[PDB]
Design a binder for this molecule. Structure first.
Ligand SMILES: Nc1nc2c(ncn2[C@@H]2O[C@H](COP(=O)(O)OP(=O)(O)O)[C@@H](O)[C@H]2O)c(=O)[nH]1
Length: 556
């Protein structure tokens, strides 16, 4: 049963499908796909074959695919050869010691050239070390509708069979002991819940069987389970090990998230660089515009929506709270999350989100909060205020190579927790002639001393009427304003900033041009108490508490 298992993956050249071969090899029972096509054969070898995508999504997609398999397959046109659509995977394929299997496809073509293509699939195949292969054999020559070189050439359908059982081994994993499995792939359905798919590392799995989740500590229960056969994932009572076993009704559930039994077990590692860096709660809009401007409010629409992204987004991680109408969403970047928000924003979603709290994950002893490699380019007299603010952000400098044309380029290493806010007043210090983006680098020990705050606070309001020049031109002698003449806010909606740490509960009812604050500039601003309402039309900045005594209430 288990020593006849062979877990492989295929790489689609330009030409998509490979069936041909993917297909016809359903030849003993048993456009397009794809996962996982587990043929069945003896002259019984179950062979789960996971199709690595022709594309590359993002944030560590394909490396996660070969976390299941122990070897690979490479389809290459005999007319043409291998391409950049193959150079994407194969590189990451050899990263784990995966012995390849080369397939010269299309052999029957009149413009085909076998041993030249082989000679290309050597030279553009070794440059990336290995270092074996060598063999690398494999080295089959295969038609679709199915006399040169290997063999050749009987029922060019069984030769490939040899290759798999001969050179691909069975997954070295323990049948017995307490159950363990790491989720490799992920998908969702409009009334399943989340769905697993993976590779059984330890033990065996009963369909109605309690379990635990890992990286955190949830003890969610199991309900249903399913095997794969043909292009279908077909239900099964119970499955052992080493298979592409597909599973439901657990939770949330995530990519990389490990999960084993409940007795004597836990856990599973292997990130590797998929784990997120940032997080913020996603809440259904409870503020005074509940279904006004927008068209998706009921929590299980949002939930539904977030899950659907967790198929595409491999660099995303969504977990569910004690509170029903709220979800801690986390991703490998603040910019990677704002995508999800503003994309959802203009699908017509009314929801709100909490402040970007950093993922203070841990690597050996020190609680290593993440850092990033900043690059910023500014006019010279701005530099004084630029440098100044960053040495207060616990942002270490690396190099500042001056171009000598009236500008300077500055290059820092800054902590994530202290990058929150700066791209507002970088654009205010430089007055627009400051241009900066950046990139995530790695986590580092404590800053230390949490100093990623902002302050002062802002001006909170106390009525649902419209803002008037009779109140705003006076209230703006406390500080700058987020609204102008005429707009109906509510009790809670921060309509501006004070000049000092004071929060105020003012009246706009009884002018300077205001501040056009973006989605990003709202999130990367709010305090831990406050929240950002995001309708599909405008953007509001509420507090979570709406009045001047309701504020004083929660303060114990
Ligand atoms: N002559 C020849 N043509 C092939 C062979 N394999 C595929 N093709 C052609 O190339 C195209 C790509 O193969 P296909 O089976 O469509 O792969 P799919 O994208 O997985 O369906 C098909 O339209 C076939 O007509 C082969 O072994 N010999």
């Amino acid at each position: 049963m288990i020593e006849k298992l062979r877990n492989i993956a295929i790489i689609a050249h330009v030409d998509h499908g490979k069936t041909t071969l993917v297909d016809k090899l359903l030849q003993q029972s048993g456009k397009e796909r794809g996962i996982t096509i587990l043929a069945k054969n003896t002259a019984d070898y179950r062979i789960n074959i996971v199709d690595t995508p022709g594309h590359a999504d993002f944030g560590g997609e394909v490396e996660r695919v070969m976390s299941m398999v122990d070897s690979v397959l490479l389809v290459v046109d005999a007319f043409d050869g291998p391409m950049p659509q193959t150079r994407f995977v194969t590189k990451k394929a050899f990263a784990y010691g995966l012995k390849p299997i080369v397939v010269i496809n299309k052999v029957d073509r009149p413009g085909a050239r076998p041993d030249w293509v082989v000679d290309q699939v050597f030279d553009l195949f070794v440059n990336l070390d290995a270092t074996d292969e060598q063999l690398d054999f494999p080295i089959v020559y295969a038609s679709a509708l199915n006399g040169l070189d290997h063999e050749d050439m009987a029922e060019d359908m069984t030769p490939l069979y040899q290759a798999i059982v001969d050179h691909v081994p069975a997954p070295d994993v323990d049948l017995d002991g307490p159950f363990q499995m790491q989720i490799s792939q992920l998908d969702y359905n409009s009334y399943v819940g989340v769905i697993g798919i993976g590779r059984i590392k330890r033990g065996k799995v009963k369909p109605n069987q309690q379990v635990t989740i890992i990286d955190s500590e949830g003890k969610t229960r199991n309900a249903k389970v399913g095997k794969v056969l043909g292009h279908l994932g077909l239900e099964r009572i119970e499955t052992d090990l080493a298979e592409a076993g597909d599973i439901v009704a657990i939770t949330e559930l995530n990519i990389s998230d490990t999960v084993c039994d409940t007795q004597n077990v836990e856990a599973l590692p292997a990130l590797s660089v998929d784990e997120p860096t940032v997080s913020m709660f996603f809440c259904v809009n409870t503020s005074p515009f509940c279904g006004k401007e927008g068209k998706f409010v009921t929590s299980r629409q949002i939930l539904d929506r977030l899950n659907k992204e967790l198929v595409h987004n491999v660099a995303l991680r969504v977990e569910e709270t004690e509170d029903a109408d709220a979800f801690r969403v986390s991703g490998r970047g603040e910019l990677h999350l704002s995508v999800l928000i503003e994309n959802m924003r203009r699908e017509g979603f009314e929801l709100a989100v909490s402040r970007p709290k950093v993922i203070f994950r841990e690597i050996d002893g020190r609680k290593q909060e993440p850092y990033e490699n900043v690059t910023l380019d500014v006019e010279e007299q701005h530099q004084g205020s630029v440098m100044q603010a960053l040495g207060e952000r616990k942002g270490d400098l690396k190099n500042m190579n001056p171009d000598g044309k009236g500008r300077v380029r500055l290059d820092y290493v800054i902590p994530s927790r202290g990058l929150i806010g700066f791209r507002s007043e970088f654009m205010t210090m430089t007055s627009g002639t400051g241009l900066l983006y950046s990139t995530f680098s790695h986590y580092d020990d404590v800053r230390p001393g949490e100093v990623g705050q902002r302050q002062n606070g802002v001006l909170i309001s106390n009525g649902q009427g419209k803002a008037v020049a009779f109140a705003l031109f006076g209230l703006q002698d406390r500080g700058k304003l987020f609204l102008g003449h005429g707009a109906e806010v509510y009790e809670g909606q921060i309509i501006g900033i004070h000049s000092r740490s004071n929060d105020l509960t003012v009246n706009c009812l009884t002018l300077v041009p205001p501040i056009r604050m973006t989605l990003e500039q709202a999130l990367e601003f709010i305090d831990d108490d406050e929240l950002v309402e995001v309708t599909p039309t405008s953007i509001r900045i509420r507090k979570r508490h709406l009045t001047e005594n309701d504020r004083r209430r929660a303060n114990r």
